Amino acid sequence: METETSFFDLYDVDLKDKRSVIGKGAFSTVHRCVNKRTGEVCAVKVIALKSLRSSEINKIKREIGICSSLQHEHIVSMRRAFRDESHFYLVFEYVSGGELFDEIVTRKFYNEKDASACMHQILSALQHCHSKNIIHRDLKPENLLLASKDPNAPVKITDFGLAVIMEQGPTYFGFAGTPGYLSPEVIRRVPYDTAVDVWACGVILYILLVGYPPFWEEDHQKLYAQIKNCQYDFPSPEWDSVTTAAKELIKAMLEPNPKRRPTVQELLQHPWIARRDVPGSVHRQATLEELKKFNARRKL
């Protein structure tokens, strides 16, 4: 990262203007900035250093190393990273399509084939991550973005703040991730690996098909219990119109034991992902309505 040059020397943005703010998070704020030299529109992630403990700062530096190691079409590319005496500035490629789940609910047509295109992009990005021994650890709809408000815009995964680098096989990296997408191995606090990402994909794919998560419980202890014992189902009637290929793919992605869980490469070679005509074609309006309820529920 550039510790000598100021972000404000290479990029232009008024951090005080409201119309510059792309996103407001609890630990950072993402503004729309413009490359002074090239005119490229970018999303800078501003992180004040003020109240930050050392663990948080090194978490950020970890995110910078990992994000710089990653150059893939379906990963939001970090252009450059800056650190001055008060702020981190993580410049990223501009992403204007918003969250994937916020856009699916606005589609007039959505079927398993669309869900398979999304999952294909997510899986390919994950294949690039795991190839470099990177575990995202926190895959969730908030991290699944669309590059543009255009149809057929690419899905890009993002937010590697919780990402870890696995050097020596299954390793304990701590208990992190959002509860609904936590892998059983992480809940058990045993050493884990890239398989945890696969787990989240399963949970995500499930949602992509029906609009509600397989593990939903307000009590996080009963939720972690459901995840450990792999207590989920395909309720009628929503799942009766789903291909058994998708159902089997989710059953595989949600394998309670990481050793029996497919790698992302194996998933990318699954017929529901690789064959353009295995996923169902019928429009799933119920998935869209349930997904509006879901999007509403997670924010609140």
Residue numbers in the entry: 3 to 302
Give me lines lifted from the publication on this model.
Ca2+/calmodulin-dependent protein kinase II (CaMKII) is a Ser/Thr kinase that is particularly important in neuronal signaling and cardiac function. CaMKII has a unique architecture, in which the catalytic domains are linked flexibly to a hub domain, also called the association domain, which forms a dodecameric or tetradecameric assembly. We reported recently that the activation of CaMKII-α by ATP and Ca2+/CaM triggers the exchange of activated subunits between different holoenzyme assemblies. Our data are consistent with the idea that the CaM-binding element induces the hub to transition from a closed-ring form to a ring-opened lock-washer configuration, which can release or capture dimer units.
